[PDB]
Enzyme design. Structure first.
Site, PDB file in Angstrom:
ATOM      1  CG  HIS A   1      38.246  47.117  33.214  1.00 32.91           C
ATOM      2  ND1 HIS A   1      38.769  46.583  34.485  1.00 32.91           N
ATOM      3  CD2 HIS A   1      38.966  48.091  33.084  1.00 32.91           C
ATOM      4  CE1 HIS A   1      39.574  47.508  34.858  1.00 32.91           C
ATOM      5  NE2 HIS A   1      40.174  48.431  34.082  1.00 32.91           N
TER       6      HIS A   1
ATOM      7  CD  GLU B   1      36.542  44.702  36.717  1.00 37.22           C
ATOM      8  OE1 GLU B   1      37.537  44.755  36.022  1.00 37.22           O
ATOM      9  OE2 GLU B   1      36.274  43.725  37.533  1.00 37.22           O
TER      10      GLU B   1
ATOM     11  CG  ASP C   1      42.623  50.388  35.087  1.00 38.94           C
ATOM     12  OD1 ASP C   1      42.742  49.028  34.761  1.00 38.94           O
ATOM     13  OD2 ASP C   1      43.577  51.134  34.535  1.00 38.94           O
ATOM     14  CD1 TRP C   2      46.803  50.792  35.076  1.00 42.11           C
ATOM     15  CD2 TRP C   2      47.816  50.669  36.862  1.00 42.11           C
ATOM     16  NE1 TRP C   2      47.553  49.736  34.837  1.00 42.11           N
ATOM     17  CE2 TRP C   2      48.262  49.867  36.143  1.00 42.11           C
ATOM     18  CE3 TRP C   2      48.613  51.080  38.248  1.00 42.11           C
ATOM     19  CZ2 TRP C   2      49.253  48.952  36.471  1.00 42.11           C
ATOM     20  CZ3 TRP C   2      49.499  50.203  38.673  1.00 42.11           C
ATOM     21  CH2 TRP C   2      49.801  49.074  37.834  1.00 42.11           C
TER      22      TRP C   2
ATOM     23  CG  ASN D   1      45.816  52.609  30.243  1.00 37.88           C
ATOM     24  OD1 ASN D   1      45.999  53.504  29.676  1.00 37.88           O
ATOM     25  ND2 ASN D   1      46.364  51.330  29.782  1.00 37.88           N
TER      26      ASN D   1
HETATM   27 CL   LIG Z   1      46.853  48.675  32.000  1.00 38.66          CL
END
Ligand SMILES: [Cl-]
Length: 294
Positions: A270, A130, A106-107, A36
């Site tokens: 990030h 990350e 991330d996701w 995201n």
């Molecule tokens: Cl998020």
């Protein structure tokens, strides 16, 4: 820092919705998964480093990139489980084979670690950066954006994301050291130009982050897959970031405890791909050559 997407966009309908993806090259699969509020675009300057080392696949999550939006959309849509149902079906459709290298952020890391834990015999190695690796407290979360994410995880999240697009307009550039070009920023804005539900995935995702035990289902998922990562001899490539964002401090110490892992550190916060794509790409290529070249 090239501005063009990598490869040609392709689409397949999954449960009546078009999903967009990149699929180039031949051989054992190297599967890059964004989170995201990004898309396959995130990997455009990284993928070229893996040419000739496999079949290079990068999908856009439902509601994201060039993938369709769900309708009617609302707060009950784009949960982790729904995202997983769409993505895992697309991956099945693509016939990835049994020597998959996953490249995760991330996701995309929660989704990819979950997939690997469910298909342990099909994964050759995992490179991650990350990533979501353990349930968290707010003490783990970058100070500058604690209030903003607590905000997302409240009724204020609808105006913040759906009206003001704060994830795209503020969080994304705030977590890149360089300034993106207008052209690059326009590619990240494209899926979310329209106010309202088009932006729902950017709000649903932070609401799934496992923080102070909620949501319990995601806490449980991450505890499950990390319990495997902690003991598996699956090869791992940890791409650390400095200063980093969600893998820092005690979480960084924790990831370093995992077995059969090597690391590098790259400059970044990030969205490290946007600060250090050459170093990341080079490291993943070296990893994959060690796993495959003969
Ligand atoms: Cl998020």
């Amino acid at each position: 820092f090239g501005v063009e997407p990598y490869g040609q966009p392709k689409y397949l309908e999954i449960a009546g919705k078009r999903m967009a993806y990149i699929d180039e090259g031949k051989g054992d699969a190297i599967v890059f998964q964004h989170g995201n509020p990004t898309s396959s675009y995130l990997w455009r300057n990284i993928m070229p480093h893996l040419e000739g080392l496999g079949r290079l696949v990068a999908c856009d999550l439902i509601g994201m990139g060039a993938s369709d939006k769900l309708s009617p959309s609302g707060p009950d849509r784009y949960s982790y489980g729904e995202q997983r149902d769409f993505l895992f079906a697309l991956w099945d459709a693509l016939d990835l084979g049994d020597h998959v290298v996953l490249v995760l952020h991330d996701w995309g890391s929660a989704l990819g670690f979950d997939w690997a834990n469910q298909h342990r015999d099909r994964v050759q190695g995992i490179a991650f950066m990350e990533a979501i690796v353990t349930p968290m407290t707010w003490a783990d979360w970058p100070p500058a954006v604690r209030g903003v994410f607590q905000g997302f995880r409240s009724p204020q999240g609808e105006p913040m994301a759906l009206e003001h697009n704060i994830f795209v307009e503020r969080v994304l550039p705030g977590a890149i050291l360089r300034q993106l070009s207008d052209e690059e920023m326009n590619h990240y804005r494209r899926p979310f130009v329209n106010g309202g539900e088009d932006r729902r995935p950017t709000l649903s995702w932070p609401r799934n982050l496992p923080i102070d035990g909620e949501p319990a289902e995601v806490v449980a998922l991450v505890n499950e897959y990390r319990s495997w990562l902690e003991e598996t001899d699956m090869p791992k490539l940890f791409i650390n970031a400095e200063p980093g964002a969600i893998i820092t401090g005690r979480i960084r110490d924790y990831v370093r405890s995992w077995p059969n892992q090597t690391e590098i550190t790259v400059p970044g916060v990030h969205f490290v791909q946007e600060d250090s794509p050459e170093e990341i790409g080079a490291a993943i290529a070296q990893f994959v050559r060690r796993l495959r070249s003969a």
